[PDB]
Amino acid sequence: TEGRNSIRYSELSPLYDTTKLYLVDNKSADIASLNYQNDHSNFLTTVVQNNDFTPTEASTQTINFDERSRWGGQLKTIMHTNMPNVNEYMFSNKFKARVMVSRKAPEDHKEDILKYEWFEFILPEGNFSATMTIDLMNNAIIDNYLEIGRQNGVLESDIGVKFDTRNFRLGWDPETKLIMPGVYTYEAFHPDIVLLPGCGVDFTESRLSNLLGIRKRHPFQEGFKIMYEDLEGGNIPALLDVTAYEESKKKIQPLEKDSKSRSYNVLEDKINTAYRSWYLSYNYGNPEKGIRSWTLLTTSDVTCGAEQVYWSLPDMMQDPVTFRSTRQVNNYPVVGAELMPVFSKSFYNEQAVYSQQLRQATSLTHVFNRFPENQILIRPPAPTITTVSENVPALTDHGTLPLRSSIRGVQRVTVTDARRRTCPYVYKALGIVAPRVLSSR
Amino acid sequence: TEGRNSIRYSELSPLYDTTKLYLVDNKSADIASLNYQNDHSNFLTTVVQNNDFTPTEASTQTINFDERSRWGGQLKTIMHTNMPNVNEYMFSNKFKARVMVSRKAPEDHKEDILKYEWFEFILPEGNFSATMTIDLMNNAIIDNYLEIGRQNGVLESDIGVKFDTRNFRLGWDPETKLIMPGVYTYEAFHPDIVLLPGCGVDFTESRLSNLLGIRKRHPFQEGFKIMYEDLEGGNIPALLDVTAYEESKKKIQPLEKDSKSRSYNVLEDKINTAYRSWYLSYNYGNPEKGIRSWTLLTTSDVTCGAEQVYWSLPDMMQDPVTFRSTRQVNNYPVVGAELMPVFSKSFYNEQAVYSQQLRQATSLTHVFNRFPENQILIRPPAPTITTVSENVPALTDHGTLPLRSSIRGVQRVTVTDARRRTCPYVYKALGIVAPRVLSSR
Amino acid sequence: TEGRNSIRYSELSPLYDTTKLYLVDNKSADIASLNYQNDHSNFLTTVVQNNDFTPTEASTQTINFDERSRWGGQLKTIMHTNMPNVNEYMFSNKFKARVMVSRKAPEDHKEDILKYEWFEFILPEGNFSATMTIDLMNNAIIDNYLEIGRQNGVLESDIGVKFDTRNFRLGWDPETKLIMPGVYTYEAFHPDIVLLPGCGVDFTESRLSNLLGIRKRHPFQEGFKIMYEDLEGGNIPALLDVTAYEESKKKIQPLEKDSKSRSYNVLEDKINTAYRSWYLSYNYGNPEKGIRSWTLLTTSDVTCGAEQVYWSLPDMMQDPVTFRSTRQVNNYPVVGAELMPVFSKSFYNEQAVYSQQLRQATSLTHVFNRFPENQILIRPPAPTITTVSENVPALTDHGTLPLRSSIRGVQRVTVTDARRRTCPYVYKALGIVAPRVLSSR
Amino acid sequence: TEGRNSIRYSELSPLYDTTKLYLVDNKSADIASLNYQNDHSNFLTTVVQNNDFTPTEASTQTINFDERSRWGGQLKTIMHTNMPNVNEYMFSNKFKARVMVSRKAPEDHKEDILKYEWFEFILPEGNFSATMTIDLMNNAIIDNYLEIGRQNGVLESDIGVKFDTRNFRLGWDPETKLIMPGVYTYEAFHPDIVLLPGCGVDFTESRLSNLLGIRKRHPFQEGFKIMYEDLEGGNIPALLDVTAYEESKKKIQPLEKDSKSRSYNVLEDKINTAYRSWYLSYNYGNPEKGIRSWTLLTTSDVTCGAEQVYWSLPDMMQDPVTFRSTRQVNNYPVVGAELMPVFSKSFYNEQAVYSQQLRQATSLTHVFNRFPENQILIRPPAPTITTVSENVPALTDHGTLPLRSSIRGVQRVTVTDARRRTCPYVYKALGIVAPRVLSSR
């Protein structure tokens, strides 16, 4: 083992069989000279710590480890990131739906031809919770109504899509098939979608379908769209009229108008309305047809997907097996993998209804909750547990890999995504390599 | 060690005695070609990172490690899951009980033959807390009463089963054997069950018996059912009448009717009612007969059971000892074991009674708490600590195992349950294998 | 190293120098055949994973590792438990005290001979906080008074023992030696005990002395009992009368009767009462005699003692040094040690007085706080921080130990206490052994 | 290996091939003798534990490890620090802006020449949250107005810079281009800046730009300043007058004066005011010109930058490769790197508006929120999640490095910054070195 384990720089003393190599980015010389167009995910840094050499003339010395021995040293990384919840880079603020336009009469409810098209709604970006994002989704539909649908003959009783977090079944007397208290329960179950005949939603090439918790049984197929004609057996039951009920006590019928004459779209029967729900058609319906054979129920996910991240270092380590040696930017043979450092955290406000009753009195006149009298179009209640994403630092150890014989003065580092593109939310990157001796030659 | 440690792919340069092998699932080529019917728990992926080959024609190259040496490399996995609390896959929304039907008079309390049968109640699914699941269990009994028992001669004073979280003994004056304040304590101890003569509950092939905290001393026997005739010495003491007490002060007897004439089923004595409780018969009864010799008292468990999970990988590693080499799906020799990544977390609301007094005023008219005047049938109070499950990622290191000589291009992975079936709630799976050299040949 | 490292089962292929061995308990064949009388702490399981053999006929095959080599493999365990705070198994619901009975007059306060004896109070079991357990201790004294002491001549002013969490000194004007506001401070310091002449408490063979925080300087001596004659220099100062004070302003004396004529047992002087306190005699007294030379002050401990746990495995590993090879159940040579997985957690309610003022208005008429007018017998205030125990899973690595040459098909596992008895609160146990090669033969 | 592995001190027994060496700073002899001018980041300590020698005469003995062998031992450190959020050492309380002075009339809004200059505001230091620092920034502008701007002709309607956390777009009816409720939403989104024509802010050589979350796409360029002429397409829309609206109902125009006649600087149109916002010009503007092509949106960062820290030890370890052996203080060859132990933590107050409505009634008359009637100059609302930094201890393991042959009695330690200067907030430093044997000689 002796003799063949020296580490010569060029003119200093030779070391023996253990050093360290620091890949930092906070040198004050590289900022003005080498790195001028690139950022913390694709920077270019030096290894020599000599400061008799500007880094343009330090790109010539070679730290040549001794030959007749195979070398190789382990890798330790420290990265630290800060990305928001909703952003444009990871496709988290887009969803397209199909809502109604141009309700006009031709020249009796056997008239009024309705029209429909697709839109690709877009909501703002920031770091939000799991409930505030629902209110931002439910604003991207109404500001389409205030632009296009109001000037035509739409009368704000047939919007079509509305994201809600209730169960429209509690209180269903099976003898009369109506809800007894004359109001729906203001309780906070799993979120769902509410449709209307002629509408639908599409979550293809988006990421908000992980936030709601509506997955798919075969997650590799073609795409993910939900129409009105898939929610069979999931109509919301009609609401009993209680102010026209006490004439029997000095008789029973559904309610149709609520203080402003908004129709509930009650059908020809006197049992249920014309609104279909996802959560009510998943377990109160048929476990063979429609839904429950096509999707799956899942808890909410605020960080909306945990993707992997690839470290690359193509001037020190040798290439792993089945990798082509290239200098194109988006191939760069991978030296280690990790997970993206974005976690989740629960908080348990526990009130969630008084804290919603009082919040829209000192902070919010009517900007959210525009329709505070209709029971279906009312604001959804907040859950008793709330979840917010957070960013933590990550300390990792990637094991040993063989390294080259001669190491150049300037070095590249690269931190990529799963689709080979640099993540712009990386704030700090830092690595330490410690070479050892392996088998002889 | 030299010479016999080369790693030849087929046409690239030979490596020496350390590489890495990435088993990812997020390749954009495998989605359209190989994996079309299966999901993240049973997928099929490639190892070659060459991108001159579609993965149908990359299933031919062999990464043959060198012979005349025994190889073997350690394994590191990263999995991430999201399952709800109550679901159908792990038998967490079923329990059967025996309640009453058809109370009619034959042609004096020596009449009215009562009947009884079993039902297998079913409650909805989602992610709930430890108290909201109690209210969902206590709704699956009343909606049977509103369907079958109300149309027969049942008068809603003899329901039979009711899940409660109180202690019906605090305030028991031993001289007069009645409760002095004329009301039970609205305090929040361990949950129990409340029976009535002719009823019972059965938790065989279910999992909700871990949520309540009612275990069994010999947990391997046959099953787990609790009848009325096991709770001997656990009758709830009768409640003293205080509004007919101040006639002595210008005398003592139990109370029978409460503002709506609901009978408390007071016995022939004037001491105790005809309701038996589990918690009151476990420590105030007999430590030899009945209960305390058959069950055990345990804290609540929201995740309801911590089961193990098995990794399988039958194209790279060799088979461990006493395993048969097969290609049936539900045998697949196991390469490592872990724990299912579902934890628990406490929150301490600390109010739990004002936050229950005020919650059913802005959110809930009478949907829960249907009987808000009877002391036994009243809503149970919430504990001062609440517990909710949560899902975290899991980073594991499984040590070294010997691997085969030639590795095919396409590889299988499989993540199973304890009863050899694929868990559908796995969202991300990821592995890294790093081969080393062992003994020679 | 080659040649002498084979692992033959009996009829499969021979492995080489690394396997794994799974000691699971969730096999569906062992439940019906082998394990029928025992539980998760002392079960009996198989190693062969062949399923051509029922485990009664699989107790014959031997996985014989190769001779002429010393073997040995490391151990990894996963255990998961759920025990309550207060229970009978770990002596956490017993304490004996000496209170008063039979105050009768012989035939002037030179009469009324008093009597005293010991009782061994017992309180119920469950999972409670650090303050609710104080209220349960303070109920086990009053229900003795309502049974035996009330029928004799005891007049509920001389109970004798009362667990309190205040400091009865704040507001002591040194000129007049009385408390100025006419009320004690309703503040929430360390808990103590309150005695009365002729009483005492004994915490021998109990565990609640760790919950209060009253330790002992020499913790190995004989036992732990505290009488009235040890608290010298710790009398509570008497309370100034303020309603008979404003006659000086159109004079100073202690108060004796409080709205129901309960005597404070004021002494012959007009300075202090006849109640002694532990916390007030520990630091306001003498640091040489009495207390402060015999006990110690310690923070509260909700889990009440962290005991160790021993793993045993007497069919695979060899015996460690100085252990006798036996098959009695309560010796079983130990293969590794851990800690019991019961932690503590703080919550900081921060109100603790309004949340106590309002709690006994919607939940509690007078069941606790029976005497809500006497200042000494009033309910103690809750601390501003509260602590509750919790149960977490435990992942441990115990290092390497040498194992036997031939391994039988059926195996024993055992998880014991520090006094060699099986803990009944173990819910899941799981181990993995991975053999390696050590020195030759 | 035998023979050549002795460790001779000078006169004790020789050890063999494993010891430990403790670098503590809490010796009571070094405080009075060696360390008299320096602190915990640059102290000077001994290794001999003999106490027959004062450390002035213990700087002569040499713990000479054996020659004809290369030695080297691993390093473990324990450091513990306490730095505030806002301080002077890390440039966290400085920002310069350009506000207005000397509005006087020359001798019709075609007069009143305005003047502008730069100031370098300075705010106090301490440990604050993410919202209280915003209020301290917004006080450093007004106390300039009360000193210089009030005595000239400035009329407190044209301050110019104001840090706000709202979105001034919610409620924008696209038909009339005004905000319908007549008030802005008191909601708590990402923070931004609010400008006025003729002003600007500069965050060069500061650190508060990481607290707001306004990053830059190329983070290496020259500096970071934001003027009014970069925020094109981001004017705040004007506010509709609702008290002059009900004359149509027994008509629509912007509002200009608010109860004290403060002008909103409404433009020649009747659509929008003359205030530009950052958050409203980032996503409602142009994704090609102005902003969104130059900056980036990021969550808040309370610790404001995670910098690295360097351990140095220039009397025991040998120098790593490409380091010059020197005794100047600010070079000192680095033996290991870490991260600064300052983390972040979220708390979720959840009220944030009632807790702001009530906070400025019992604690704050008008010191903050000086203008509680103007909608633009009102106090910004607090977020529903708040983040505070915290300090934790750090336990690290730095691997092995080769050490010298003879070790002197006195030793140096040094803990530096990224710009080679001693951090004054280090409270405890502690290291343990354990030598082993490497290759022979």
Author numbering:
A (entry chain x), B (entry chain s), C (entry chain u), D (entry chain o): 49 to 155, 171 to 313, 367 to 557
From the paper:
We created ADDomer, an adenovirus-derived multimeric protein-based self-assembling nanoparticle scaffold engineered to facilitate plug-and-play display of multiple immunogenic epitopes from pathogens. The penton-forming protomer of certain adenovirus serotypes can self-assemble into a symmetric, hollow dodecahedron adopted by 12 pentons comprising altogether 60 protomers, effectively representing a proteinaceous, nonenveloped VLP. The protomer represents a two-domain architecture, with a crown region comprising the VL and RGD loop abutting a jellyroll fold mediating multimerization. The RGD loop contains a conserved tripeptide motif (-RGD-) mediating integrin-based internalization into target cells.
We used cryo–electron microscopy at near-atomic resolution and implemented novel, cost-effective, high-performance cloud computing to reveal architectural features in unprecedented detail. Our structure shows that the plasticity of the RGD loop and VL, essential for antigenic epitope presentation, is maintained in ADDomer. Close inspection of our cryo-EM structure reveals notable differences. The fiber-binding cleft adopts a rearranged conformation, seemingly in between the geometries observed in the crystals of apo- and fiber-bound Ad3 dodecahedron. In our cryo-EM structure, we observed additional density in between the crown and jellyroll domains, juxtaposed to four sulfur-containing amino acids (M131, M138, M458, and C539), consistent with a tetradentate coordination by a metal ion, possibly zinc or iron. We posit that a structural metal ion at this interdomain interface could be important for stabilizing this protein fold. No corresponding density is observed by cryo-EM. Consequently, glutamates E466 do not extend into the cavity, but the corresponding α-helices are slightly shifted in the ADDomer. Rather, in ADDomer, two neighboring protomers engage in hydrogen bonds in the vicinity of the twofold axis, extending from the S61 side chain to the peptide backbone of E59 and vice versa. We did not observe either of these features by cryo-EM and thus wondered about ramifications for ADDomer stability.
